[PDB]
């Protein structure tokens, strides 16, 4: 739901 703090690259490329 709410946007949480992302770490590195989630799964993007």
From Swiss-Prot:
What this protein is called in its record is: Neurotensin
The portion of the full protein included here is 151 to 163 of 170
Q: Which organism is it from?
A: Homo sapiens (Human)
Going by the entry's taxonomy, the superkingdom of the source organism is recorded as: Eukaryota
Instruction: List residue numbers at the site (Cleavage).
Output: 10-12
From which lineage does this chain's organism come? Eukaryota, Metazoa, Chordata, Craniata, Vertebrata
Q: Could you tell me which residues carry Pyrrolidone carboxylic acid?
A: 1
Post-translational modification note:
Neurotensin is cleaved and degraded by Angiotensin-converting enzyme (ACE) and neprilysin (MME).
